Design an enzyme around this catalytic site. Structure first.
Site, PDB file in Angstrom:
ATOM      1  N   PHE A   1      -9.988   4.376  10.599  1.00 17.68           N
ATOM      2  CA  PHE A   1      -9.324   4.521   9.355  1.00 17.68           C
ATOM      3  C   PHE A   1      -9.587   5.839   8.694  1.00 17.68           C
ATOM      4  CE2 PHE A   1      -9.297   3.862   4.764  1.00 17.68           C
ATOM      5  CZ  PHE A   1      -7.938   3.588   4.630  1.00 17.68           C
TER       6      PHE A   1
ATOM      7  N   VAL B   1      -9.985   9.478   8.365  1.00 18.65           N
ATOM      8  CA  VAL B   1      -9.641  10.812   8.889  1.00 18.65           C
ATOM      9  C   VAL B   1     -10.879  11.741   8.944  1.00 18.65           C
ATOM     10  CG1 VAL B   1      -8.350  12.970   8.462  1.00 18.65           C
ATOM     11  CG2 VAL B   1      -7.316  10.696   7.931  1.00 18.65           C
TER      12      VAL B   1
ATOM     13  N   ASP C   1      -0.544   5.072   0.691  1.00 17.74           N
ATOM     14  CA  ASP C   1      -0.781   6.069   1.755  1.00 17.74           C
ATOM     15  C   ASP C   1      -0.771   5.421   3.146  1.00 17.74           C
ATOM     16  OD1 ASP C   1      -1.283   8.458   0.188  1.00 17.74           O
ATOM     17  OD2 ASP C   1      -3.094   7.334  -0.592  1.00 17.74           O
TER      18      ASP C   1
ATOM     19  N   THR D   1      -2.574   0.743  -4.725  1.00 19.73           N
ATOM     20  CA  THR D   1      -3.031   1.951  -4.067  1.00 19.73           C
ATOM     21  C   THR D   1      -4.373   2.370  -4.662  1.00 19.73           C
ATOM     22  OG1 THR D   1      -2.461   4.286  -3.572  1.00 19.73           O
ATOM     23  CG2 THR D   1      -1.612   3.410  -5.582  1.00 19.73           C
TER      24      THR D   1
ATOM     25  N   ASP E   1      -2.286  -0.554   5.826  1.00 27.35           N
ATOM     26  CA  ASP E   1      -2.738  -0.060   7.140  1.00 27.35           C
ATOM     27  C   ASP E   1      -4.246  -0.028   7.393  1.00 27.35           C
ATOM     28  OD1 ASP E   1      -2.952   2.153   5.379  1.00 27.35           O
ATOM     29  OD2 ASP E   1      -2.986   3.521   7.111  1.00 27.35           O
TER      30      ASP E   1
ATOM     31  N   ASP F   1       0.767  -1.201   0.000  1.00 27.11           N
ATOM     32  CA  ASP F   1       0.000   0.000   0.000  1.00 27.11           C
ATOM     33  C   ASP F   1       0.831   1.302   0.000  1.00 27.11           C
ATOM     34  OD1 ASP F   1      -2.445   1.494   0.340  1.00 27.11           O
ATOM     35  OD2 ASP F   1      -2.059   1.499   2.512  1.00 27.11           O
TER      36      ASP F   1
ATOM     37  N   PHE G   1       0.822  10.079   4.802  1.00 27.78           N
ATOM     38  CA  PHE G   1      -0.461  10.720   4.594  1.00 27.78           C
ATOM     39  C   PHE G   1      -0.896  11.431   5.883  1.00 27.78           C
ATOM     40  CE2 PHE G   1      -4.491  11.026   2.238  1.00 27.78           C
ATOM     41  CZ  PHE G   1      -5.335  11.314   3.258  1.00 27.78           C
TER      42      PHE G   1
ATOM     43  N   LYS H   1      -8.848  -3.992  -3.887  1.00 26.55           N
ATOM     44  CA  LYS H   1      -7.621  -4.767  -3.864  1.00 26.55           C
ATOM     45  C   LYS H   1      -7.835  -6.233  -3.819  1.00 26.55           C
ATOM     46  CE  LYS H   1      -5.356  -0.819  -1.827  1.00 26.55           C
ATOM     47  NZ  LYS H   1      -4.266  -0.317  -0.942  1.00 26.55           N
TER      48      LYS H   1
ATOM     49  N   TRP I   1      -6.817  16.955   1.096  1.00 22.33           N
ATOM     50  CA  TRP I   1      -6.326  15.912   0.181  1.00 22.33           C
ATOM     51  C   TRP I   1      -6.808  16.026  -1.240  1.00 22.33           C
ATOM     52  CZ3 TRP I   1      -8.366  13.720   4.836  1.00 22.33           C
ATOM     53  CH2 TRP I   1      -9.669  13.243   4.732  1.00 22.33           C
TER      54      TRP I   1
HETATM   55  C1  LIG Z   1     -11.543   8.723   0.432  1.00 19.71           C
HETATM   56  C2  LIG Z   1     -11.314   9.063   1.766  1.00 19.71           C
HETATM   57  C3  LIG Z   1     -10.022   8.921   2.279  1.00 19.71           C
HETATM   58  N1  LIG Z   1      -9.721   9.256   3.605  1.00 19.71           N
HETATM   59  C4  LIG Z   1      -8.347   9.054   4.117  1.00 19.71           C
HETATM   60  C5  LIG Z   1      -8.168   7.590   4.521  1.00 19.71           C
HETATM   61  C6  LIG Z   1      -7.187   6.944   3.455  1.00 19.71           C
HETATM   62  O1  LIG Z   1      -7.934   6.216   2.510  1.00 19.71           O
HETATM   63  C7  LIG Z   1      -7.450   6.023   1.197  1.00 19.71           C
HETATM   64  C8  LIG Z   1      -8.607   5.660   0.412  1.00 19.71           C
HETATM   65  C9  LIG Z   1      -8.802   6.213  -0.852  1.00 19.71           C
HETATM   66  C10 LIG Z   1      -9.925   5.905  -1.622  1.00 19.71           C
HETATM   67  C11 LIG Z   1     -10.926   5.058  -1.147  1.00 19.71           C
HETATM   68  C12 LIG Z   1     -12.108   4.735  -1.908  1.00 19.71           C
HETATM   69  O2  LIG Z   1     -12.290   5.116  -3.104  1.00 19.71           O
HETATM   70  O3  LIG Z   1     -13.043   4.045  -1.375  1.00 19.71           O
HETATM   71  C13 LIG Z   1     -10.741   4.529   0.120  1.00 19.71           C
HETATM   72  C14 LIG Z   1      -9.611   4.812   0.909  1.00 19.71           C
HETATM   73  P1  LIG Z   1      -6.092   4.916   1.022  1.00 19.71           P
HETATM   74  O4  LIG Z   1      -6.735   3.630   0.911  1.00 19.71           O
HETATM   75  O5  LIG Z   1      -5.155   4.938   2.218  1.00 19.71           O
HETATM   76  O6  LIG Z   1      -5.467   5.385  -0.304  1.00 19.71           O
HETATM   77  O7  LIG Z   1      -7.192   7.425   0.705  1.00 19.71           O
HETATM   78  C15 LIG Z   1      -6.174   8.133   1.362  1.00 19.71           C
HETATM   79  C16 LIG Z   1      -6.493   8.184   2.867  1.00 19.71           C
HETATM   80  O8  LIG Z   1      -7.485   9.189   3.016  1.00 19.71           O
HETATM   81  C17 LIG Z   1     -10.717   9.721   4.428  1.00 19.71           C
HETATM   82  O9  LIG Z   1     -10.574  10.024   5.607  1.00 19.71           O
HETATM   83  N2  LIG Z   1     -11.976   9.865   3.942  1.00 19.71           N
HETATM   84  C18 LIG Z   1     -12.291   9.566   2.634  1.00 19.71           C
HETATM   85  O10 LIG Z   1     -13.457   9.732   2.357  1.00 19.71           O
HETATM   86  K   LIG Z   2      -3.493   3.330   3.413  1.00 22.36           K
END
Ligand SMILES: Cc1cn([C@H]2C[C@H]3O[C@](c4ccc(C(=O)O)cc4)(P(=O)(O)O)OC[C@H]3O2)c(=O)[nH]c1=O
Ligand SMILES: [K+]
Ligand SMILES: Cc1cn([C@H]2C[C@H]3O[C@](c4ccc(C(=O)O)cc4)(P(=O)(O)O)OC[C@H]3O2)c(=O)[nH]c1=O
Ligand SMILES: [K+]
Ligand SMILES: [K+]
Ligand SMILES: [K+]
Lengths: 193, 193
Positions: free
Chosen positions: B41, B43, B9, B96, B142, B7, B15, B131, B62
């Protein structure tokens, strides 16, 4: 659920026609390859054989901003994939390899999917150079030779017909989808339990 | 060959620290969550509970240009993955999920990989929301809950420790990688034939 991977360029999006149109417009004094005379997967290689420096000029078309975004769908592609995705017990993912220059192509492919399939379909996108590591029942892709890190992929590769592969004799039991007008439901059904 | 998905982020790219720094700079009059007090998980969910409108403000960090590109690597992440990729009989892919707003994030993730791992490593990138449809021996991620269209993924999920998951009791036989200083070679070796 049956899982189907669908390639993007040359299967959903008319890469060959878009390329040719933009090549001829940008390079009107250069020779070109008519779609009917396309042979072999790699556009750039065929163009490089046609004349010195033409490979690099070809590449410059698909590395240009808006090349991917402005590709027109193939006939029947958007309708078929929408229907496919709506079937019971059927998961469809768009599994596409971006070109090596990444400034525009990944972004434009997401934008193109949003445009033709809607925001919710973005969740179905897999961008990868190696499709062998993506597990599925079926992979519909116009490339004849699909290889990578997994020597025994879980999918059956169904060859989507294109200009460049239409004359190829495939090894039994390899199979084709001739166009989106062809009977893609029958192919899916042959893999269902 | 052993296949490992890594992974991005919260595993390669910091992140949480990048988010917090930019949040506080842009919104200095708002409350925030110290990294040590991160729970869960998502944020955005934690921030939305802290105060009305804060979820949307978090998201805005972000979704901003250069957020992904400017993330700093975790300690030991680049060195570990370079070593891992160089091992005999070991294929490493960076797997990712981009955020839903696609203007910057896919592009920046390719650019970030090029920066820290070089052009040739771009070939190892898989961008996907799901994934479970990527086959491998190991997935180092994570996120505690990794689900999708494949009910029985081929990989073992090794939980990479983060602020937000460090107190979680996992169900036996689920396992952790505490940091890149932890013994990731031993985990890989436990899956080799
Ligand atoms: C999309 C999304 C992300 N995040 C945080 C948590 C973590 O999730 C992912 C992420 C990104 C996209 C999705 C999705 O399309 O469902 C889920 C997690 P990661 O899996 O770690 O890349 O995005 C970056 C980080 O951002 C968050 O807190 N809320 C959100 O709605
Ligand atoms: K992650
Ligand atoms: C990268 C590349 C692509 N092409 C043509 C052939 C076809 O290949 C892909 C393509 C893209 C990237 C790679 C790769 O990274 O190895 C391979 C094929 P597709 O698989 O259909 O998306 O890119 C769009 C099309 O562009 C070509 O003629 N020469 C090239 O060097
Ligand atoms: K193709
Ligand atoms: K369905
Ligand atoms: K290796």
């Amino acid at each position: 659920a049956l899982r189907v991977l669908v390639d993007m360029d040359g299967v959903l999006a008319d890469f060959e026609g878009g390329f040719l149109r933009k090549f001829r417009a940008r390079f009107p004094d250069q020779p070109f390859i008519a779609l009917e005379d396309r042979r072999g997967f790699w556009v750039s290689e065929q163009y490089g054989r046609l004349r010195p420096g033409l490979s690099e000029k070809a590449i410059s078309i698909w590395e240009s901003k808006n090349f991917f975004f402005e590709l027109e769908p193939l006939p029947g592609a958007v309708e078929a994939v929408k229907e496919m995705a709506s079937l019971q017990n059927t998961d469809v993912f768009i599994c596409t390899s971006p070109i090596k220059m990444f400034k525009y192509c990944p972004y434009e492919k997401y934008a193109w999917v949003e445009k033709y399939f809607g925001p919710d379909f973005l969740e179905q996108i897999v961008l990868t150079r190696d499709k062998t590591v993506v597990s599925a029942d079926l992979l519909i892709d116009d490339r004849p030779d699909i290889t990578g890190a997994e020597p025994t992929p879980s999918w059956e590769h169904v060859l989507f017909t294109a200009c460049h592969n239409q004359h190829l004799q495939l090894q039994p039991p390899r199979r084709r989808l001739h166009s989106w007008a062809d009977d893609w439901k029958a192919i899916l059904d042959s893999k269902r339990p």
